């Protein structure tokens, strides 16, 4: 419950938000898109100038959204590698007098990658249920990879909206056709991850629902056959689930009333090997999470954003330095602090150098954190010098 080392992150800029967002507000792009509840959407980027850079946060407008409409979720992706362009999906709710009127807008336009052109290409589609999360996945149909939308609904069902070149439009299709594991749901699904495998026809699918039911499925794609299945009933809503390779595969479950945990060796031990992240429950409710290498050591670490304005970062030890009883578990690497509840993160190279900035969307706005440049300037030089020396010794 004690940090080991200081935070190597230095905050660069901070753009204030007039109105708050929600956990589904953060989108991708090397630009960035973030939308507020009241329909104001902003594009974040950086512009170079002589020997420095400057953040730019430019508001954007989409054609067919009512001024009274309230935006619920947003996402986007790039077209399939055979194709070209980007597609942006936004789900809002009209206020039909005293009822909700859900909807879904899909924007996709040379100008296939031009965001300004894509700003007005939408299609208006009813939803008949209150949407929860707009995500997307890539599937192997025939011998071609195709990217399709996914959207959890008020009725415990996931509704796929596939593109069609014949009509050049997105139409709803049954989810059982492509995703056998995404059927027969009891509670609404807050978060859902589809982890493809590299180069094979297999993959994993992880999902958690409001009641705390978490289902993980090892699913093929060529035969569309579920191989195995595991499920666990926890307490409290499942805020986040991420499928990641620790070094073999493992998963991370971030609840809202219990310490976040990681289940190891899914394909070899099911869901019986559990490691809890110590002390990650003393800071209110874990609203977000992200798994990547923040230590620049070539091995991933776990980021946990709490409602109590905390940004804990946990590091895995590793059997390579296995220490008997205190075995290769998890320990608190370091801990930062903020002033607003934390909602979403992103790990994107906005500057344009190869170093990855961390964008954090909180209640009042967006913080662009960078690595400590002084630390990230001597370390690269030492690595390069060692590389040259070993090359000479090996020459």
């Amino acid at each position: 419950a004690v940090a080991a080392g200081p935070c190597p992150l230095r905050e660069d800029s901070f753009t204030r938000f007039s109105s708050q967002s929600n956990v589904y507000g953060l989108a991708g792009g090397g630009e960035l898109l973030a939308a507020t509840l009241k329909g104001k959407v902003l594009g974040f980027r950086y512009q170079d100038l002589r020997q420095k850079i400057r953040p730019v946060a430019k508001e954007l407008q989409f054609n067919y959204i009512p001024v009274d409409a309230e935006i619920v979720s947003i996402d986007t992706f790039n077209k399939s590698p055979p194709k070209r362009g980007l597609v942006v999906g936004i789900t809002f709710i009209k206020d039909s007098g005293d009822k909700g009127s859900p909807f879904l807008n899909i924007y996709c336009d040379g100008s296939e990658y031009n965001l300004d052109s894509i700003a007005q290409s939408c299609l208006n589609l009813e939803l008949q249920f209150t949407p929860f999360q707009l995500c997307h996945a890539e599937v192997q149909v025939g011998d071609q990879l195709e990217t399709v939308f996914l959207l959890s609904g008020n009725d415990p069902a996931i509704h796929l909206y596939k593109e069609n070149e014949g009509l050049h439009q997105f139409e709803e299709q049954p989810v059982e056709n492509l995703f056998p594991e995404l059927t027969n749901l009891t509670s609404s699904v807050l978060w859902l991850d589809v982890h493809n495998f590299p180069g094979t026809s297999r993959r994993l699918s992880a999902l958690g629902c409001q009641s705390g039911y978490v289902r993980v499925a090892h699913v093929d794609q060529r035969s569309r056959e579920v191989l195995q299945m595991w499920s666990v009933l926890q307490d409290g809503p499942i805020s986040r689930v991420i499928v990641f390779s620790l070094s073999e595969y493992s998963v991370l479950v971030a609840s809202m009333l219990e310490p976040a945990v990681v289940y190891r060796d899914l394909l070899n031990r099911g869901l019986e090997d559990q490691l809890l992240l110590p002390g990650s429950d003393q800071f209110d409710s874990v609203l977000c999470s992200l798994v990547t290498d923040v230590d620049l050591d070539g091995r991933p670490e776990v980021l946990v954003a709490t409602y109590g304005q905390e940004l804990l970062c946990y590091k895995y030890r590793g059997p390579e330095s296995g220490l008997p009883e205190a075995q290769h578990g998890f320990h608190l690497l370091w801990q930062r602090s903020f002033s607003s509840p934390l909602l979403a993160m992103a790990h994107v190279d906005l500057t344009g150098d190869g170093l990855q900035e961390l964008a954090v969307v909180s209640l009042k706005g967006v913080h662009i954190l960078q690595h400590s440049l002084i630390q990230a300037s001597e370390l690269v030089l030492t690595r390069l010098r060692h590389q040259v020396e070993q090359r000479r010794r090996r020459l």
């Binding site: 109105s19 708050q20 967002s21 929600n22 956990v23 589904y24 507000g25 509840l37 309230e70 619920v72 709710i93 909700g100 209150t130 929860f132 008020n154 609404s188 807050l190 409001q210 705390g212 666990v232 009933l233 926890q234 307490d235 409290g236 809503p237 805020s239 479950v253 609840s255 809202m256 009333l257 219990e258 310490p259 945990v261 559990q274 809890l276 209110d284 409710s285 609203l287 409602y307 002033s339 607003s340 509840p341 909602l343 209640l363 009042k364």
Partner: protein, 409 residues
């Protein structure tokens, strides 16, 4: 000698549970309802989420002590998690998320258990008490409660208890469980709010207490039964999960009941004086001052001085200055509806307040202000140049000396 071990064991204080209560008194003890006997009991608890177990257990212990002054409630949860007969006492007290516990409450009367021969607790007892007092024909009769717990499943089992007592216990347990479920529903609504999904969940669409007349504060503030809530935590960035989240929400909400009063008062006593009315309360003066910044001040010394007559002269000087100020546009503000003077002059950009008082051998003038704002400040420092707190003292002293010339004392 041997005093603690005969109570640490044989009384359920330490050690482990007997194999009798491990599995025997749950079979053919429950079947007493199948055959039909005088120990029927049941429960239908279906708790949503397991984090309510400790509060529910504490309340149930309280109830047991309430309608039983002889029971000896003692939780015997198996604190090993291996499999067999792991029941180790948990002194007046979770580990893993997915782990589902297994608890076994018990209730007993040690005094009656000491030597059952007479009426244990007549009229609040077995309803089969007593028994022949003759030796060998002694009285086998006692009472017990053996509530069992699964992940989310309670089963109430009583034996040899007053039927009204048992029925009341069952009804109370069901009601308490429903109370806790309603509290959990409120907490879930709050959590769904926190992520920024407002019209996705809510304490409007969904049990005696689930009616659309729920008293939120009573549920939050109580662990036992006796602005639009759907958008409470929206754009608000203010500083047992149920207690935690509920009290946080309570303070967040009270931070508006204790705030909008100030705005209401300031708007009221700005529009009233904009176009003095009434004796504004003394307490309101503190708000009016602490909500305003001390812009300018001026001071002078009363030279007609080295006394009661001096006090009277100072009062006359003060009243002359008050008259002069009133000849400019500033009105007087009455005070003390249970020597210091206060004036004012409302302006379109805001209000201006002046305080006049005498300190030792000096006279004090302070100007407050309370608000684009450039125009207000342009006229805000248009009273400073017209204070003239020096020429006035000059003329006052000269008039006083002339009057004393035209007179005597």
């Amino acid at each position: 000698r041997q005093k603690r071990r005969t109570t640490q064991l044989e009384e359920g204080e330490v050690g482990t549970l007997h194999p009798v209560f491990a599995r025997v008194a749950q079979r053919w003890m429950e079947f007493m309802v199948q055959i039909g006997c005088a120990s029927v009991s049941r429960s239908s608890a279906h708790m949503v989420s397991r984090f309510l177990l400790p509060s529910i257990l504490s309340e149930f212990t309280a109830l047991v002590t309430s309608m039983a002054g002889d029971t000896s409630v003692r939780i015997f949860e198996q604190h090993l998690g291996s499999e067999p007969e792991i029941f180790g006492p948990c002194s007046p007290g979770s580990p893993r998320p997915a782990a589902e516990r297994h608890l076994l409450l018990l209730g007993r009367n040690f005094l009656q258990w000491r030597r059952p021969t007479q009426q244990a607790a007549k009229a609040m007892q077995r309803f089969e008490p007593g028994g022949d007092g003759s030796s060998g024909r002694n009285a086998p009769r006692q009472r017990l409660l053996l509530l069992e717990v699964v992940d989310k499943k309670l089963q109430l089992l009583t034996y040899n208890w007053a039927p009204d007592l048992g029925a009341a216990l069952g009804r109370a347990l069901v009601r308490l469980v429903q109370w806790q479920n309603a509290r959990a529903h409120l907490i879930f609504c709050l959590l769904s709010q926190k992520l920024g999904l407002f019209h996705h969940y809510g304490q409007l669409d969904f049990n005696p207490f689930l009616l659309p007349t729920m008293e939120v504060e009573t549920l939050i503030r109580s662990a036992s039964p006796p602005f639009p809530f759907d958008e409470a935590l929206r754009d608000i960035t203010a500083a047992d999960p149920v207690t935690y989240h509920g009290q946080q929400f309570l303070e967040i909400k009270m931070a508006e009941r204790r705030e909008l009063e100030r705005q209401m008062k300031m708007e009221n006593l700005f529009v009233t004086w904009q176009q003095a009315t009434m004796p504004i309360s003394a307490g309101e003066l503190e708000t009016l001052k602490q909500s305003s910044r001390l812009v300018h001040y001026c001071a002078t010394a009363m030279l007609f001085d080295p006394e009661p007559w001096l006090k009277e002269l100072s009062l006359a000087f003060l009243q002359q200055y008050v008259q002069y100020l009133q000849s400019i546009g500033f009105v007087l503000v009455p005070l003390r509806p249970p020597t210091t003077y206060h004036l004012q002059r409302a302006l379109p950009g805001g209000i201006i307040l002046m305080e006049l008082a005498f300190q030792g051998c000096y006279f004090c003038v302070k100007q407050f202000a309370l608000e684009l704002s450039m125009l207000f400040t342009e006229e805000c420092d248009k009273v400073r140049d017209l204070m003239h707190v020096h020429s006035f003292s000059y003329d006052f002293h000269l008039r006083l000396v002339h009057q004393h010339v035209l007179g005597a004392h």
